[PDB]
Enzyme design. Structure first.
Site, PDB file in Angstrom:
ATOM      1  N   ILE A  12      52.740  69.462  56.898  1.00 28.27           N
ATOM      2  CA  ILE A  12      52.011  69.201  58.128  1.00 28.27           C
ATOM      3  C   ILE A  12      52.048  67.706  58.398  1.00 28.27           C
ATOM      4  O   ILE A  12      52.267  67.272  59.526  1.00 28.27           O
ATOM      5  CB  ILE A  12      50.554  69.697  58.073  1.00 28.27           C
ATOM      6  CG1 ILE A  12      50.513  71.193  57.795  1.00 28.27           C
ATOM      7  CG2 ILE A  12      49.848  69.433  59.388  1.00 28.27           C
ATOM      8  CD1 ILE A  12      49.149  71.686  57.405  1.00 28.27           C
ATOM      9  N   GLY A  13      51.858  66.917  57.354  1.00 32.55           N
ATOM     10  CA  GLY A  13      51.836  65.483  57.520  1.00 32.55           C
ATOM     11  C   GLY A  13      51.845  64.768  56.196  1.00 32.55           C
ATOM     12  O   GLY A  13      51.435  65.308  55.171  1.00 32.55           O
ATOM     13  N   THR A  14      52.342  63.545  56.221  1.00 36.36           N
ATOM     14  CA  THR A  14      52.284  62.684  55.065  1.00 36.36           C
ATOM     15  C   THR A  14      51.109  61.770  55.318  1.00 36.36           C
ATOM     16  O   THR A  14      51.083  61.046  56.303  1.00 36.36           O
ATOM     17  CB  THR A  14      53.573  61.872  54.928  1.00 36.36           C
ATOM     18  OG1 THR A  14      54.692  62.760  55.047  1.00 36.36           O
ATOM     19  CG2 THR A  14      53.635  61.155  53.571  1.00 36.36           C
ATOM     20  N   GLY A  15      50.106  61.853  54.458  1.00 34.01           N
ATOM     21  CA  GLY A  15      48.961  60.972  54.547  1.00 34.01           C
ATOM     22  C   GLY A  15      49.227  59.676  53.816  1.00 34.01           C
ATOM     23  O   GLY A  15      50.360  59.395  53.425  1.00 34.01           O
ATOM     24  N   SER A  16      48.183  58.880  53.623  1.00 33.31           N
ATOM     25  CA  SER A  16      48.338  57.600  52.951  1.00 33.31           C
ATOM     26  C   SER A  16      48.476  57.824  51.454  1.00 33.31           C
ATOM     27  O   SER A  16      49.002  56.981  50.730  1.00 33.31           O
ATOM     28  CB  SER A  16      47.148  56.684  53.249  1.00 33.31           C
ATOM     29  OG  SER A  16      46.953  56.513  54.647  1.00 33.31           O
ATOM     30  N   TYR A  17      48.012  58.984  51.003  1.00 34.21           N
ATOM     31  CA  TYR A  17      47.947  59.290  49.578  1.00 34.21           C
ATOM     32  C   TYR A  17      48.807  60.481  49.166  1.00 34.21           C
ATOM     33  O   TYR A  17      48.693  60.980  48.055  1.00 34.21           O
ATOM     34  CB  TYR A  17      46.493  59.498  49.155  1.00 34.21           C
ATOM     35  CG  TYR A  17      45.640  58.295  49.456  1.00 34.21           C
ATOM     36  CD1 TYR A  17      45.539  57.250  48.550  1.00 34.21           C
ATOM     37  CD2 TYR A  17      44.955  58.189  50.662  1.00 34.21           C
ATOM     38  CE1 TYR A  17      44.766  56.141  48.825  1.00 34.21           C
ATOM     39  CE2 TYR A  17      44.183  57.081  50.950  1.00 34.21           C
ATOM     40  CZ  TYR A  17      44.094  56.059  50.028  1.00 34.21           C
ATOM     41  OH  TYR A  17      43.325  54.955  50.306  1.00 34.21           O
ATOM     42  N   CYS A  20      50.239  66.504  53.056  1.00 35.88           N
ATOM     43  CA  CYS A  20      49.483  67.707  53.324  1.00 35.88           C
ATOM     44  C   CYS A  20      50.459  68.778  53.762  1.00 35.88           C
ATOM     45  O   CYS A  20      51.235  68.586  54.701  1.00 35.88           O
ATOM     46  CB  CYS A  20      48.455  67.485  54.430  1.00 35.88           C
ATOM     47  SG  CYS A  20      47.506  68.941  54.837  1.00 35.88           S
ATOM     48  N   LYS A  35      46.719  69.448  49.408  1.00 33.41           N
ATOM     49  CA  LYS A  35      46.942  68.019  49.472  1.00 33.41           C
ATOM     50  C   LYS A  35      47.575  67.538  48.182  1.00 33.41           C
ATOM     51  O   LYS A  35      47.012  67.681  47.101  1.00 33.41           O
ATOM     52  CB  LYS A  35      45.648  67.278  49.821  1.00 33.41           C
ATOM     53  CG  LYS A  35      45.513  67.039  51.314  1.00 33.41           C
ATOM     54  CD  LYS A  35      44.113  67.320  51.824  1.00 33.41           C
ATOM     55  CE  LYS A  35      43.891  66.732  53.208  1.00 33.41           C
ATOM     56  NZ  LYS A  35      43.707  65.257  53.141  1.00 33.41           N
ATOM     57  N   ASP A 133      32.737  59.805  56.249  1.00 35.77           N
ATOM     58  CA  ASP A 133      33.363  58.923  57.235  1.00 35.77           C
ATOM     59  C   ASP A 133      33.751  59.741  58.472  1.00 35.77           C
ATOM     60  O   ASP A 133      34.581  60.647  58.398  1.00 35.77           O
ATOM     61  CB  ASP A 133      34.589  58.234  56.614  1.00 35.77           C
ATOM     62  CG  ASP A 133      35.305  57.312  57.584  1.00 35.77           C
ATOM     63  OD1 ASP A 133      34.857  57.183  58.742  1.00 35.77           O
ATOM     64  OD2 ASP A 133      36.325  56.713  57.177  1.00 35.77           O
TER      65      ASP A 133
HETATM   66  N1  LIG Z   1      42.571  71.194  56.321  1.00 27.80           N
HETATM   67  C1  LIG Z   1      43.571  70.922  57.197  1.00 27.80           C
HETATM   68  N2  LIG Z   1      44.054  71.877  58.024  1.00 27.80           N
HETATM   69  C2  LIG Z   1      45.043  71.647  58.907  1.00 27.80           C
HETATM   70  N3  LIG Z   1      45.634  70.450  59.046  1.00 27.80           N
HETATM   71  C3  LIG Z   1      45.252  69.397  58.283  1.00 27.80           C
HETATM   72  C4  LIG Z   1      44.175  69.570  57.297  1.00 27.80           C
HETATM   73  N4  LIG Z   1      44.013  68.374  56.698  1.00 27.80           N
HETATM   74  C5  LIG Z   1      44.906  67.506  57.247  1.00 27.80           C
HETATM   75  N5  LIG Z   1      45.630  68.122  58.200  1.00 27.80           N
HETATM   76  C6  LIG Z   1      46.704  67.510  59.003  1.00 27.80           C
HETATM   77  O1  LIG Z   1      47.722  67.071  58.103  1.00 27.80           O
HETATM   78  C7  LIG Z   1      48.180  65.764  58.473  1.00 27.80           C
HETATM   79  C8  LIG Z   1      48.130  64.835  57.264  1.00 27.80           C
HETATM   80  O2  LIG Z   1      46.878  64.151  57.172  1.00 27.80           O
HETATM   81  P1  LIG Z   1      46.139  63.965  55.743  1.00 27.80           P
HETATM   82  O3  LIG Z   1      47.146  63.543  54.697  1.00 27.80           O
HETATM   83  O4  LIG Z   1      45.220  65.121  55.473  1.00 27.80           O
HETATM   84  O5  LIG Z   1      45.187  62.686  55.905  1.00 27.80           O
HETATM   85  P2  LIG Z   1      45.668  61.283  56.524  1.00 27.80           P
HETATM   86  O6  LIG Z   1      44.709  60.905  57.631  1.00 27.80           O
HETATM   87  O7  LIG Z   1      47.145  61.344  56.832  1.00 27.80           O
HETATM   88  O8  LIG Z   1      45.438  60.373  55.212  1.00 27.80           O
HETATM   89  P3  LIG Z   1      43.970  60.222  54.559  1.00 27.80           P
HETATM   90  O9  LIG Z   1      42.966  60.363  55.682  1.00 27.80           O
HETATM   91  O10 LIG Z   1      43.984  58.942  53.757  1.00 27.80           O
HETATM   92  S1  LIG Z   1      43.682  61.799  53.232  1.00 27.80           S
HETATM   93  C9  LIG Z   1      47.352  65.297  59.657  1.00 27.80           C
HETATM   94  O11 LIG Z   1      48.119  65.522  60.834  1.00 27.80           O
HETATM   95  C10 LIG Z   1      46.192  66.263  59.705  1.00 27.80           C
HETATM   96  O12 LIG Z   1      45.866  66.561  61.061  1.00 27.80           O
HETATM   97 MG   LIG Z   2      42.685  62.996  56.230  1.00 28.20          MG
END
Ligand SMILES: Nc1ncnc2c1ncn2[C@@H]1O[C@H](COP(=O)(O)OP(=O)(O)OP(O)(O)=S)[C@@H](O)[C@H]1O
Ligand SMILES: [Mg+2]
Ligand SMILES: [Cl-]
Length: 271
Positions: A12-17, A20, A35, A133
Protein backbone atom coordinates in the site's frame (compact mmCIF):
# COMPACT_ATOMS: atom_id res chain seq x y z
CA UNK A 1 1.84 -16.28 14.64
CA UNK A 2 3.42 -17.36 11.34
CA UNK A 3 4.14 -15.51 8.07
CA UNK A 4 2.86 -18.53 6.11
CA UNK A 5 -0.58 -17.77 7.53
CA UNK A 6 -0.83 -14.68 5.35
CA UNK A 7 -0.57 -13.85 1.66
CA UNK A 8 0.81 -10.42 0.79
CA UNK A 9 -1.34 -8.94 -1.97
CA UNK A 10 0.47 -5.66 -2.66
CA UNK A 11 2.34 -2.81 -1.01
CA UNK A 12 0.00 0.00 0.00
CA UNK A 13 2.82 2.33 0.90
CA UNK A 14 6.35 2.66 2.13
CA UNK A 15 6.33 4.54 5.40
CA UNK A 16 9.28 6.13 7.15
CA UNK A 17 9.87 2.91 9.06
CA UNK A 18 9.07 0.29 6.43
CA UNK A 19 6.32 -1.00 4.19
CA UNK A 20 2.63 -1.22 4.83
CA UNK A 21 1.17 -4.07 2.85
CA UNK A 22 -2.31 -5.34 2.13
CA UNK A 23 -2.45 -9.01 3.12
CA UNK A 24 -4.98 -11.85 3.02
CA UNK A 25 -5.31 -14.13 6.03
CA UNK A 26 -5.37 -17.70 4.69
CA UNK A 27 -7.63 -19.25 7.35
CA UNK A 28 -10.63 -17.24 6.13
CA UNK A 29 -9.53 -14.89 3.33
CA UNK A 30 -9.83 -11.89 5.68
CA UNK A 31 -8.25 -8.77 4.19
CA UNK A 32 -5.84 -7.01 6.52
CA UNK A 33 -2.63 -5.03 6.45
CA UNK A 34 0.69 -5.53 8.15
CA UNK A 35 3.48 -3.13 8.95
CA UNK A 36 6.93 -4.37 8.05
CA UNK A 37 9.61 -3.36 10.55
CA UNK A 38 13.31 -4.24 10.49
CA UNK A 39 14.47 -4.53 14.12
CA UNK A 40 18.02 -5.51 13.18
CA UNK A 41 19.66 -2.37 14.57
CA UNK A 42 17.77 -2.48 17.87
CA UNK A 43 19.27 -3.15 21.30
CA UNK A 44 17.66 -5.53 23.80
CA UNK A 45 16.39 -2.51 25.73
CA UNK A 46 14.66 -0.97 22.71
CA UNK A 47 13.01 -4.28 21.89
CA UNK A 48 11.46 -4.81 25.32
CA UNK A 49 10.05 -1.28 25.12
CA UNK A 50 8.77 -2.11 21.65
CA UNK A 51 7.18 -5.25 23.13
CA UNK A 52 5.58 -3.04 25.79
CA UNK A 53 4.07 -0.66 23.21
CA UNK A 54 2.63 -3.52 21.16
CA UNK A 55 0.99 -5.02 24.24
CA UNK A 56 -0.71 -1.69 24.99
CA UNK A 57 -1.69 -1.46 21.34
CA UNK A 58 -3.39 -4.88 21.39
CA UNK A 59 -5.21 -3.74 24.50
CA UNK A 60 -7.14 -1.07 22.56
CA UNK A 61 -10.39 -2.45 21.34
CA UNK A 62 -12.59 0.33 20.06
CA UNK A 63 -14.61 0.78 16.86
CA UNK A 64 -12.90 4.15 16.37
CA UNK A 65 -9.32 2.95 16.80
CA UNK A 66 -7.52 0.95 14.10
CA UNK A 67 -7.73 -2.62 15.43
CA UNK A 68 -4.62 -4.65 16.25
CA UNK A 69 -4.56 -8.28 15.05
CA UNK A 70 -1.20 -10.09 15.24
CA UNK A 71 2.60 -10.01 15.53
CA UNK A 72 4.93 -12.05 13.36
CA UNK A 73 8.70 -12.32 13.53
CA UNK A 74 10.91 -13.53 10.71
CA UNK A 75 14.32 -13.56 12.38
CA UNK A 76 16.02 -14.43 9.09
CA UNK A 77 15.35 -10.89 7.86
CA UNK A 78 15.12 -9.50 11.40
CA UNK A 79 11.67 -8.34 10.37
CA UNK A 80 8.74 -7.79 12.69
CA UNK A 81 5.24 -7.65 11.15
CA UNK A 82 2.31 -6.02 12.87
CA UNK A 83 -1.04 -7.17 11.48
CA UNK A 84 -3.66 -4.42 11.55
CA UNK A 85 -7.22 -3.76 10.38
CA UNK A 86 -7.50 -2.77 6.71
CA UNK A 87 -8.98 0.65 6.27
CA UNK A 88 -10.41 0.78 2.81
CA UNK A 89 -11.10 4.53 2.61
CA UNK A 90 -7.48 5.47 3.31
CA UNK A 91 -6.19 8.31 5.48
CA UNK A 92 -7.48 11.88 5.95
CA UNK A 93 -4.40 13.53 4.46
CA UNK A 94 -5.30 12.03 1.06
CA UNK A 95 -8.90 13.15 1.52
CA UNK A 96 -7.71 16.71 2.17
CA UNK A 97 -5.32 16.58 -0.77
CA UNK A 98 -8.19 15.36 -2.95
CA UNK A 99 -10.39 18.20 -1.77
CA UNK A 100 -7.81 20.77 -2.86
CA UNK A 101 -7.10 19.24 -6.28
CA UNK A 102 -10.79 18.87 -7.19
CA UNK A 103 -11.53 22.34 -5.78
CA UNK A 104 -14.33 20.94 -3.61
CA UNK A 105 -15.09 21.29 0.11
CA UNK A 106 -15.97 18.36 2.36
CA UNK A 107 -19.59 17.84 3.45
CA UNK A 108 -20.37 19.15 6.94
CA UNK A 109 -21.87 15.70 7.66
CA UNK A 110 -18.44 14.20 7.06
CA UNK A 111 -16.71 16.71 9.34
CA UNK A 112 -19.29 15.80 12.00
CA UNK A 113 -18.54 12.09 11.58
CA UNK A 114 -14.80 12.71 12.14
CA UNK A 115 -15.52 15.07 15.04
CA UNK A 116 -17.76 12.52 16.76
CA UNK A 117 -15.78 9.34 16.18
CA UNK A 118 -12.35 10.93 16.79
CA UNK A 119 -13.55 12.42 20.06
CA UNK A 120 -14.72 8.94 21.11
CA UNK A 121 -11.32 7.58 20.08
CA UNK A 122 -9.72 10.21 22.34
CA UNK A 123 -11.99 9.52 25.32
CA UNK A 124 -10.77 5.91 25.03
CA UNK A 125 -7.07 6.88 24.78
CA UNK A 126 -7.34 9.10 27.83
CA UNK A 127 -9.12 6.40 29.83
CA UNK A 128 -6.12 4.15 29.29
CA UNK A 129 -3.50 6.72 30.29
CA UNK A 130 0.30 6.19 24.48
CA UNK A 131 0.52 7.75 21.03
CA UNK A 132 -2.34 10.06 20.07
CA UNK A 133 -0.80 12.30 17.39
CA UNK A 134 -3.81 13.61 15.45
CA UNK A 135 -2.34 14.55 12.04
CA UNK A 136 -4.64 13.70 9.06
CA UNK A 137 -2.23 10.97 7.95
CA UNK A 138 -2.90 9.14 11.23
CA UNK A 139 -6.66 9.04 10.68
CA UNK A 140 -8.34 6.37 8.56
CA UNK A 141 -11.68 5.56 6.98
CA UNK A 142 -13.16 2.12 6.48
CA UNK A 143 -15.77 1.22 3.86
CA UNK A 144 -18.72 2.06 6.10
CA UNK A 145 -18.27 5.77 6.98
CA UNK A 146 -16.38 4.81 10.13
CA UNK A 147 -13.42 6.88 11.29
CA UNK A 148 -10.46 5.32 13.04
CA UNK A 149 -7.43 6.71 14.83
CA UNK A 150 -4.28 4.92 13.66
CA UNK A 151 -1.26 6.57 15.24
CA UNK A 152 1.52 4.00 14.96
CA UNK A 153 4.00 5.88 17.15
CA UNK A 154 5.49 2.47 17.94
CA UNK A 155 7.79 2.51 14.93
CA UNK A 156 9.87 5.59 15.86
CA UNK A 157 12.14 3.42 18.00
CA UNK A 158 13.39 1.33 15.05
CA UNK A 159 15.43 4.06 13.32
CA UNK A 160 16.53 7.04 15.41
CA UNK A 161 18.03 8.72 12.36
CA UNK A 162 14.73 8.77 10.50
CA UNK A 163 12.89 9.60 13.72
CA UNK A 164 15.18 12.59 14.31
CA UNK A 165 14.78 13.91 10.77
CA UNK A 166 11.00 13.59 11.09
CA UNK A 167 11.03 15.52 14.36
CA UNK A 168 13.45 18.22 13.18
CA UNK A 169 12.35 18.83 9.59
CA UNK A 170 8.62 18.64 10.26
CA UNK A 171 6.37 21.53 11.23
CA UNK A 172 4.13 21.04 14.32
CA UNK A 173 1.03 22.70 12.82
CA UNK A 174 -1.11 21.10 15.53
CA UNK A 175 1.07 22.09 18.51
CA UNK A 176 -0.94 23.53 21.43
CA UNK A 177 0.35 26.67 23.19
CA UNK A 178 0.81 24.64 26.42
CA UNK A 179 2.98 22.08 24.68
CA UNK A 180 5.02 24.79 22.98
CA UNK A 181 5.75 26.53 26.30
CA UNK A 182 7.60 23.56 27.86
CA UNK A 183 4.56 21.43 28.77
CA UNK A 184 3.64 17.78 29.21
CA UNK A 185 0.56 15.54 29.48
CA UNK A 186 -2.77 17.39 29.39
CA UNK A 187 -5.91 16.07 27.65
CA UNK A 188 -7.11 19.56 26.75
CA UNK A 189 -3.99 19.67 24.57
CA UNK A 190 -5.48 16.84 22.49
CA UNK A 191 -8.67 18.90 22.06
CA UNK A 192 -6.68 21.75 20.53
CA UNK A 193 -5.07 19.28 18.11
CA UNK A 194 -8.49 17.87 17.20
CA UNK A 195 -9.66 21.43 16.53
CA UNK A 196 -6.73 21.98 14.13
CA UNK A 197 -7.63 18.75 12.33
CA UNK A 198 -11.33 19.54 11.94
CA UNK A 199 -10.38 23.05 10.88
CA UNK A 200 -8.07 21.71 8.18
CA UNK A 201 -10.88 19.39 7.14
CA UNK A 202 -13.15 22.42 6.63
CA UNK A 203 -10.74 25.03 5.22
CA UNK A 204 -8.40 22.52 3.53
CA UNK A 205 -5.58 24.30 5.31
CA UNK A 206 -4.44 24.35 8.94
CA UNK A 207 -5.53 27.33 11.10
CA UNK A 208 -1.90 28.44 11.61
CA UNK A 209 0.65 28.41 8.81
CA UNK A 210 4.19 29.70 8.44
CA UNK A 211 7.47 29.09 6.66
CA UNK A 212 9.27 29.21 9.99
CA UNK A 213 8.79 27.52 13.35
CA UNK A 214 9.18 30.75 15.31
CA UNK A 215 6.75 32.42 12.90
CA UNK A 216 4.32 29.56 13.48
CA UNK A 217 4.83 29.94 17.23
CA UNK A 218 3.89 33.61 17.07
CA UNK A 219 0.71 32.75 15.14
CA UNK A 220 -0.37 30.06 17.61
CA UNK A 221 0.52 32.32 20.54
CA UNK A 222 -1.90 34.96 19.18
CA UNK A 223 -4.68 32.41 18.60
CA UNK A 224 -6.18 34.14 15.55
CA UNK A 225 -7.27 32.36 12.37
CA UNK A 226 -9.76 32.75 9.53
CA UNK A 227 -13.31 31.52 10.02
CA UNK A 228 -13.82 28.19 8.28
CA UNK A 229 -15.69 28.58 4.96
CA UNK A 230 -19.27 29.92 5.06
CA UNK A 231 -20.75 26.65 3.72
CA UNK A 232 -20.18 25.35 7.28
CA UNK A 233 -22.72 26.19 9.97
CA UNK A 234 -22.12 28.73 12.74
CA UNK A 235 -22.55 25.82 15.17
CA UNK A 236 -19.70 23.80 13.68
CA UNK A 237 -17.59 26.96 13.49
CA UNK A 238 -18.22 27.79 17.16
CA UNK A 239 -17.27 24.28 18.36
CA UNK A 240 -14.04 24.15 16.35
CA UNK A 241 -13.22 27.74 17.37
CA UNK A 242 -13.77 26.61 20.94
CA UNK A 243 -11.25 23.76 20.69
CA UNK A 244 -8.71 26.34 19.46
CA UNK A 245 -9.05 28.53 22.56
CA UNK A 246 -5.74 29.83 23.92
CA UNK A 247 -6.77 28.61 27.37
CA UNK A 248 -6.90 24.84 27.81
CA UNK A 249 -9.60 25.32 30.45
CA UNK A 250 -11.87 27.12 27.96
CA UNK A 251 -11.63 24.21 25.51
CA UNK A 252 -14.52 21.73 25.64
CA UNK A 253 -13.96 18.34 27.27
CA UNK A 254 -14.68 15.11 25.39
CA UNK A 255 -17.99 14.99 27.32
CA UNK A 256 -18.86 18.60 26.45
CA UNK A 257 -18.10 18.04 22.77
CA UNK A 258 -20.34 14.97 22.59
CA UNK A 259 -23.20 16.91 24.21
CA UNK A 260 -23.24 19.30 21.26
CA UNK A 261 -26.62 19.35 19.41
CA UNK A 262 -24.76 18.89 16.10
CA UNK A 263 -23.71 15.35 17.09
CA UNK A 264 -26.28 12.65 16.31
CA UNK A 265 -26.48 8.85 16.33
CA UNK A 266 -25.75 8.49 12.58
CA UNK A 267 -22.47 10.38 13.08
CA UNK A 268 -21.18 7.52 15.25
CA UNK A 269 -19.83 4.20 14.00
CA UNK A 270 -21.88 1.46 12.32
CA UNK A 271 -20.21 -1.87 11.68
N1 LIG B 1 -4.58 0.21 8.68
C1 LIG B 1 -4.44 0.66 7.41
N2 LIG B 1 -5.35 0.36 6.46
C2 LIG B 1 -5.26 0.79 5.19
N3 LIG B 1 -4.25 1.56 4.75
C3 LIG B 1 -3.26 1.95 5.60
C4 LIG B 1 -3.30 1.52 7.00
N4 LIG B 1 -2.21 2.05 7.59
C5 LIG B 1 -1.52 2.75 6.65
N5 LIG B 1 -2.17 2.70 5.47
C6 LIG B 1 -1.72 3.33 4.21
O1 LIG B 1 -0.45 2.78 3.88
C7 LIG B 1 0.44 3.81 3.45
C8 LIG B 1 1.75 3.73 4.23
O2 LIG B 1 1.71 4.53 5.41
P1 LIG B 1 2.32 3.98 6.81
O3 LIG B 1 3.66 3.32 6.56
O4 LIG B 1 1.27 3.25 7.59
O5 LIG B 1 2.68 5.28 7.67
P2 LIG B 1 3.51 6.53 7.11
O6 LIG B 1 2.70 7.79 7.38
O7 LIG B 1 3.95 6.25 5.69
O8 LIG B 1 4.78 6.43 8.09
P3 LIG B 1 4.60 6.56 9.69
O9 LIG B 1 3.41 7.46 9.93
O10 LIG B 1 5.94 6.96 10.25
S1 LIG B 1 4.14 4.67 10.45
C9 LIG B 1 -0.28 5.14 3.58
O11 LIG B 1 -0.76 5.49 2.29
C10 LIG B 1 -1.50 4.82 4.42
O12 LIG B 1 -2.62 5.56 3.95
MG1 LIG C 1 1.16 6.00 9.58
CL1 LIG D 1 -11.77 25.03 -2.89
Amino acid sequence: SRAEDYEVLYTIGTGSYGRCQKIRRKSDGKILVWKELDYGSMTEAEKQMLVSEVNLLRELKHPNIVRYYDRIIDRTNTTLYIVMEYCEGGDLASVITKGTKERQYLDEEFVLRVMTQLTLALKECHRRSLHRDLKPANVFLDGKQNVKLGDFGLARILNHDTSFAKAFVGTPYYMSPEQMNRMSYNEKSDIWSLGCLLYELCALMPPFTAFSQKELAGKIREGKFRRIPYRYSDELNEIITRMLNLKDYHRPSVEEILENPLILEHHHHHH
